[PDB]
Design a protein around this ligand. Structure first.
Ligand SMILES: [Zn+2]
Ligand SMILES: [Zn+2]
Ligand SMILES: [Zn+2]
Lengths: 225, 214
C-alpha cells in the first residue's frame, strides 16, 4: 500500500534550524509530486508548496516563498521540509501528501501521519499540581465535583489518571491552555457521590514525560487556612 | 490566490441525517474542487475530486455536486464514523487553497450544565498565585457564557477557558474556566463568583464563595 511516514515530533527554540522528513513507500517515489501542508493549532489546512522528485522542481505558496525550503532525495524516496531560523509562529502540525492527478486536477490521495513542530522560548518544566475541592459547606447536591489543576508545565503533554487508573467514569481532562508565561495549564475533574467525600480518597496522578516527573495529589479541602 | 469559503462553519446532525455543506470560490474554478475528511489528531482523507468523482474506497453515501463557484458535499444517511471536519480544496490554479473547514457534530437534546466553583489551594497561595476555577459539566449545546465577578465586579482579561470534545457516551460538552490573580490581589477581595448563562438554564446560575468563609 502507498505509504508516507513522517519524522517524529520536534520541540525547538526560536532561531534554531530544523529539517523534517517524509518517506514514501509502496509506489514509485519519483513518479508523484509531494506537497507540504501546514495546520496551526485549532486551525485549518494551508498548502505550502510542492516538489516533483523526478527533476527537483519546486513551487511555493506566496506566503511561504523564501520562508521554507522543500527538497527531495529520490535515492531514498524521501522529501524534506526545512527552516533556517524558526519562529514561535511556525508552531503547527506539518503534513506531507502525495499528489495524484485525476479528473484533471491534483488531488492529495495519501497523507503522512503529520509531524508536530512546537517552537517556543520556554524551557522544559514539570507541572505543579493543586487540588480542586469545594468549600466545606457548599456540597448540597447528591453528587460533587473534585479535580486537580495541573499548572505551569512545558512542553505538552501531561497524562492524568485518577486513583491509579481505578477511577475512569465521569473523568473529564480538559485541553491545555497556553498561558502568557509560555507555560501550559490544564485541569482534570471527576464527579463522585457526595456521600463518598468523607469515606473515599481521590488522588490525581500526573505524568510529564519531557521533564521525567510524576506528581500524585490527594484532593481535599483543609478546615483552616 | 483563489479564496475558498465554506458554510456553515459547524453543524449538528443525527445519525441517519442527510447533511449538506457548501463551498464557494472567489472566482470560477470549473470542476476542479476536491473534498477531504479529517478527524482530531489524524491525517486528512480524500473523499471526492473533480467536484463529483468518488475517490476509490470511499463509501457512496458521500457525493459532490456543483461547478464554477458553488459546490456542495452531501452525506446521505450520516453514520457514526462521519462526525469529523470537512475541507474543500480548489485545484484549478496555483496556489492550491483550502476552505476553512466545517465541523459536523452530534445533535442531542438540550442539557443544562452542573456548575461548580473551586477556591485556590493553600499550596498554590504559598507560591504567590491564586487560581479560581469554575466547572460547567455535561451540557448541550456548546454555546455557554461564563462571567467572573470579584466583589461583584465583572472581570476581564484575567481568565482562560477550554472545552472538551463531545462525550463518547452522552454527546455533551464540559467547560473549565480559570481566573488567575496574584495572592496579594486575591487576599484583598471577599466575594468570588462565576455566573453561567446557557440555553438549558431558565436564568443565569451563580456559584460563589467568600474568602475566609470557605
Ligand atoms: Zn517536473
Ligand atoms: Zn474587592
Ligand atoms: Zn476552608
Amino acid at each position: 500500500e502507498v505509504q508516507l511516514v513522517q519524522s517524529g515530533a520536534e520541540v525547538k527554540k526560536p532561531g534554531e534550524s530544523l529539517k523534517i522528513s517524509c518517506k514514501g513507500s509502496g509506489y514509485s517515489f519519483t513518479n508523484y509530486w509531494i506537497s507540504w501542508v501546514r495546520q496551526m493549532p485549532g486551525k485549518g489546512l494551508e498548502w505550502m508548496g510542492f516538489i516533483d522528485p523526478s527533476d527537483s522542481y519546486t513551487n511555493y505558496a506566496p506566503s511561504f516563498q523564501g520562508q521554507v525550503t522543500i527538497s527531495a532525495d529520490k535515492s531514498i524516496s524521501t522529501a524534506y521540509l526545512q527552516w533556517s531560523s524558526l519562529k514561535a509562529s511556525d508552531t503547527a502540525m506539518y503534513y506531507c501528501a502525495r499528489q495524484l492527478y485525476q479528473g484533471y486536477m491534483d488531488t492529495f490521495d495519501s497523507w503522512g501521519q503529520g509531524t508536530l513542530v512546537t517552537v517556543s522560548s520556554a524551557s522544559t518544566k514539570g507541572p505543579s499540581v493543586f487540588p480542586l475541592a469545594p468549600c466545606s459547606r457548599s456540597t448540597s447536591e447528591s453528587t460533587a465535583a473534585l479535580g486537580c489543576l495541573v499548572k505551569d508545565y512545558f512542553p505538552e503533554p501531561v497524562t492524568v489518571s485518577w486513583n491509579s487508573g481505578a477511577l475512569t467514569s465521569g473523568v473529564h481532562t480538559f485541553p491545555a491552555v497556553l498561558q502568557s508565561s509560555g507555560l501550559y495549564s490544564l485541569s482534570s475533574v471527576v464527579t463522585v457521590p457526595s456521600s463518598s467525600l468523607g469515606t473515599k480518597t481521590y488522588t490525581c496522578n500526573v505524568d510529564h514525560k519531557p521533564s521525567n516527573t510524576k506528581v500524585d495529589k490527594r484532593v481535599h479541602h483543609h478546615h483552616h487556612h | 490566490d483563489i479564496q475558498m469559503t465554506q458554510s456553515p462553519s459547524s453543524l449538528s446532525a443525527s445519525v441517519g441525517d442527510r447533511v449538506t455543506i457548501t463551498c464557494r470560490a472567489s472566482q470560477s474554478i470549473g470542476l476542479y474542487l476536491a473534498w477531504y475528511q479529517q478527524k482530531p489528531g489524524k491525517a486528512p482523507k480524500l473523499l471526492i475530486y473533480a467536484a463529483s468523482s468518488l475517490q476509490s474506497g470511499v463509501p457512496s453515501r458521500f457525493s459532490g455536486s456543483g461547478s464554477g463557484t458553488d459546490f456542495t458535499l452531501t452525506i446521505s444517511s450520516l453514520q457514526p464514523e462521519d462526525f469529523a471536519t470537512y475541507y474543500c480544496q480548489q485545484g484549478n490554479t496555483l496556489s492550491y487553497t483550502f476552505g476553512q473547514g466545517t465541523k459536523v457534530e452530534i445533535k442531542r437534546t438540550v442539557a443544562a450544565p452542573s456548575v461548580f466553583i473551586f477556591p485556590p489551594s493553600d499550596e498554590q497561595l504559598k507560591s504567590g498565585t491564586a487560581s479560581v476555577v469554575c466547572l460547567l459539566n455535561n451540557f448541550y449545546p456548546r454555546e455557554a457564557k461564563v462571567q467572573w465577578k470579584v466583589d461583584n465586579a465583572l472581570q476581564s482579561g484575567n481568565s482562560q477557558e477550554s472545552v472538551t470534545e463531545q462525550d463518547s457516551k452522552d454527546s455533551t460538552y464540559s467547560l473549565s474556566s480559570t481566573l488567575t490573580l496574584s495572592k496579594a490581589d486575591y487576599e484583598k477581595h471577599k466575594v468570588y463568583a462565576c455566573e453561567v448563562t446557557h440555553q438549558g438554564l431558565s436564568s443565569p446560575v451563580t456559584k460563589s464563595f467568600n474568602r475566609g468563609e470557605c
